Structure 1
Amino acid sequence: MLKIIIPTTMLLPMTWMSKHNMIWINATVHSLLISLISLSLLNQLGENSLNFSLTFFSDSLSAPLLVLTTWLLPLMLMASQSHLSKETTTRKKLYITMLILLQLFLIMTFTATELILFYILFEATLVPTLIIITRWGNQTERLNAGLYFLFYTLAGSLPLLVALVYIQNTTGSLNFLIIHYWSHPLSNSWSNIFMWLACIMAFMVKMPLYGLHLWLPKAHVEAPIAGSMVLAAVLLKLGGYGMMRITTILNPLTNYMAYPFLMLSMWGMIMTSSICLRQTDLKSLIAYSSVSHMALVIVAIMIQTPWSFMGATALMIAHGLTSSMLFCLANTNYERVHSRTMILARGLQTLLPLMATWWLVASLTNLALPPSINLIGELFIITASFSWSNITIILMGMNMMITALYSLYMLITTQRGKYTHHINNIKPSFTRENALMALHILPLLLLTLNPKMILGPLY
């Protein structure tokens, strides 16, 4: 697995010894090459896993997330090129260093055969994101956002650590393989109930759960474009990956303990979808839509059936790509208008038609139009939920309707109607922005041709 980790580490000396006007070109080229290298982990087995060494292993749950993580860095560099143009060379190199460090931590987090090593890297990711938000954010609220984004996480993550070490004192190991093979039933006890809660809440706060989702709109609205991209695409999926990994030792207590979280998710998806209907901020709207999709993923993981896990994997990948694209489109609007308010710049289809096409495709894929992988994950989760209880179909159908409603509302408000008269600084879209949108969207429509690559280890 070092054939991916070492080039990512070499990205740092290459960045810092680059010329003042060659940092973006070199970083983008070598990040794309690293993505191409990482693309060969998709050759998975129907047997156990790709156990490279005692420290790192690969899975068909890990490999799609790793490929997405590698693919996200070049796009983040392209998106950050514009608003960081007036910046000093040292600070641009520091920004690129933060991005590379975040990729390295994510890559090691997703393989991480140990639960303590997974926890350490899972929390190491928290530092570069915090620096990116609180340093290169525009508004005065960024600091506050960072505080929220920090403490929420730690509020859930310190109990997990305690539980983790406790488990190793009783089991003797925290290796995923030994943990899976030597799993024993968890008795219905108060001690076991609190161990279950300690194991779950850390990943639950990062999805985020509906009750604990307040940090996310703050962090996304306050962060720069690359920060928003990585938060929506990869960092939200750490909770899903961790829950899928750790729920193996929580049976049969999950049957009883899942009820409050299932109710919170099934009602909060309706709640956040309706919130999206009355939102004056594009970034806030996209953040709330992300909360709804991750609520569906939480339901999938808690149900804990093969179709649930397949749908959860597919939905995580699809949402990562779609939400990153949506944030990029909103940022292209913001870099022209400097307002970030949806109602201000109107009728942009008449002034920017190709970007209107990109908006339409992104809205269609957020809307879960078949046969997109968004709908593949949605439908698999919905079928699993129907088998769990036939009454869930009501809430799922309401969520689908409201999702279509706010997606097309966001499209119509910004692209249709009459242009705002007093806005005259709207320039033709750049080749960089069009290429960014294309590099987001073509992978989705290619993945719909080979869905088994993103359906996980239970396929």
Structure 2
Amino acid sequence: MLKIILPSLMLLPLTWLSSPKKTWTNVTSYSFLISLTSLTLLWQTDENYKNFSNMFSSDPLSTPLIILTAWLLPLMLMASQNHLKKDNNVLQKLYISMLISLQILLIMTFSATELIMFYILFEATLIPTLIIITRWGNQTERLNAGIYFLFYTLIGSIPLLIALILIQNHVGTLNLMILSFTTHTLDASWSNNLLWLACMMAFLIKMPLYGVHLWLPKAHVEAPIAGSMILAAILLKLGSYGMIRISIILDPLTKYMAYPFILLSLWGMIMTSSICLRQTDLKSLIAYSSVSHMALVIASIMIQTPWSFMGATMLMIAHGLTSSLLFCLANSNYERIHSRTMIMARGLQMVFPLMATWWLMASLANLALPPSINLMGELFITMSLFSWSNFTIILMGINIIITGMYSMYMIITTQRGKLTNHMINLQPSHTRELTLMALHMIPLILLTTSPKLITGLTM
């Protein structure tokens, strides 16, 4: 793992010791190379997971997330070059350093064998994110957004720390290999129920749930493009990874302590997908779609069946890619008109014909167009739930309908229709942002070709 982390560190001196002109090229290229190096984790020729030390490891669940996190860095760097073009060299270097630190901390979190390192880094991913949001966001709601984002997470995480320390005092170690073989039934009691709550609510607030999801749209709306990308793609997957890892020691309390959360998720899916219809802000639309999608992940993880974990992993990967893509697409038009409203620019297929194919393909991946992996996850989650209770497919299906509806609405009222002739400032598409969409899309094709990689420990 050091062979993936130490290069990510040396990227920092490469960022600072580089000439102002060649600072972006070097870091971008070497980040691509590190994304390449991260592909050795897929060399799993057995059912024996990779343990590199007492601290670093990588299972079939953490490897996809690590590769996605190593691959998103250069895309964020690229997306973050049109803005920052008028900022000073030191500010650009500081932005790049924030992004690199995020990459490093996330790779650590996904490689961690122990839950205390996971927690420390889970929390350390707040500093660079908050800085990015509040320092390079454009409107004044930056600050309230950062506040929400900090304190939802911390108020959720503190109980998690208490519960981890309790488990330490009771068992002797917070290692994940040991806590899986040395396990005991949790006697059903209010104490252990509060332990379940403590262990879960931090992640549930980070996925997020329906009842607690207001920190996400504020951030995405008020966050620069890179922050939105990393947030949507990884900083939500963080909670699902945590739940999947920690739900082994909460058996069987998960059988009856889940109904509230399964239910909230299944219903908030509908609520959010419906919000995505009467929504003026494109970024808010993307965020509410993300919430609708993560609700399924939460429910799946709650029922903890193999099909369920598999669909959840696939949906995590695919949603990360496609949401990063949609935010890139939105910011493309934002850089022209400097407005987030989806009603102002509504004929962009008559000027950007190629960029519209990216909109089309993304909105098709947003909805479940097969054989996309955005669809296999939804399908296996639907199947797991149907097995759970045959009355879930009702809500699943109305969510499907609403999903198609608002994705089509997005692309229609944004690209199709009559062009806004007063928008003389609609410069053609930049090779850079086109490369961005291509790099977001092609990996989806490749995964759809080889889904065995993004299944997870269950398969």
TM-score with structure 1 length normalisation? 0.99
In structure 2, the partner of 1:81 is 81
For 1:7-32, what per-residue CA distance to the aligned partner results, in whole angstroms no more than 9, with x for missing partners?
A: 00100000000001111101100000
Number of the residue aligned with 1:25? 25
Helix, strand or coil at the partner of 2:248: helix
User: What is the DSSP-based 3-state SS (H/G/I as helix, E as strand, rest coil) of the residue aligned with 1:249?
Assistant: coil
Q: State whether structure 2 residue 59 is matched by structure 1 residue 63.
A: no
Structure 2 distance, partners of 1:349, 1:46, is: 49
State yes or no: 1:93 paired with 2:83.
Answer: no
Cα deviation code 1:125-175 (max 9, x no counterpart): 111000000101000000110000000000100000001001110011100
Q: State how 1:24-423 maps to structure 2 within 5 Å.
A: 24-423=24-423
Indicate conservation of the 8 Å contact 1:44/1:59, yes or no. Answer: no
- SS where residue 82 of structure 1 aligns? coil
Tell me the SS of whatever aligns to 1:457: coil
Counterpart CA distance in 2 for 1:447 and 1:265 is 27
**How far is 1:362 from its partner?**
0.7
Distance in structure 1 (CA, Å) of the matches to 2:69 and 2:19: 26
For 2:452, the aligned partner's letter is K
1:202-230 per-position Cα deviation (integer Å, ceiling 9, x unaligned): 11000000001010000000000000000
CA offsets, 1:397-445, max 9 Å, x none?
Answer: 0111100000000000000000112111101101111111001000001
Which consecutive segments of 4 or more residues in structure 1 shift more than 4 A?
A: none
Letter in 1 for 2:391: I
Distance 1:45 1:219 in 2: 41
Question: Identity of counterpart residues, as a percentage?
Answer: 73
Is contact 1:210–1:264 with CA below 8 Å preserved after alignment? yes
**C-alpha distance in structure 2 between counterparts of 1:45 and 1:391, whole Å:** 40
Q: Structure 1 CA distance, aligned partners of 2:45 and 2:130? A: 37
User: In the superposition, relative to structure 1, how do residues 395 and 46 fare at CA in structure 2: closer, same or farther (>3 Å)?
Assistant: farther
Contact 1:346 1:419 in 2 (8 A): yes
Q: Give the partner amino acid of 1:290.
A: S
Any conservation in 2 of the 1:213–1:291 contact (CA below 8 Å)? yes
The residue type paired with residue 155 of structure 1 is I
CA distance in 2, matches of 1:48, 1:202: 30
Distance 1:446 1:439 in 2: 11
Matched, 1:10 2:10: yes
Question: Which residue does 1:424 correspond to in 2?
Answer: 424
Rounded to whole Å, the distance in 2 between the matches of 1:119 and 1:246 is: 12
1:274-321 deviation digits (Å, cap 9, x = unpaired): 000100000000000000000010011001000000000000000000
Partner SS, residue 231 of structure 1: helix
Unaligned runs of 5+ in 1: none
Tell me, in whole angstroms, the C-alpha distance in 2 between the residues paired with 1:215 and 1:44.
Answer: 38
Unaligned runs of 5+ in 2: none
CA distance in 1, matches of 2:5, 2:323: 26
Q: Secondary structure at the match of 1:375?
A: helix
Amino acid in structure 2 at the alignment position of 1:303: I
Question: How much does 1:368 deviate?
Answer: 1.2
Deviation at 1:46, TM superposition (A): 4.2
1:93 is aligned with what amino acid?
K
Asked if the contact 1:347–1:419 (Cα under 8 Å) also holds between the matched residues in 2, the reply is: yes
Which amino acid is 1:13 matched to? P
C-alpha separation in 2, matches of 1:158 and 1:324? 29
Cα separation, 1, equivalents of 2:48 and 2:309: 16
Residue type of the partner of 1:458? T
What is the rounded CA distance, in whole Å, between the counterparts of 2:335 and 2:135 in structure 1?
18
Cα deviation, residue 45, structure 1:
4.8
Cα RMSD for the two superposed structures: 0.6
- Distance, in Å, in 1 between the alignment partners of 2:445 and 2:46 is 25
Count, aligned residues: 459
Distance 1:218 1:47 in 2: 42
Task: Give the deviation of 1:335 after TM superposition.
Answer: 0.2
Letter in 1 for 2:277: L
One-letter code aligned to 1:308: S
TM-score relative to the length of structure 2:
0.99
Amino acid at match of 2:288: Y
Distance 1:101 1:445 in 2: 29
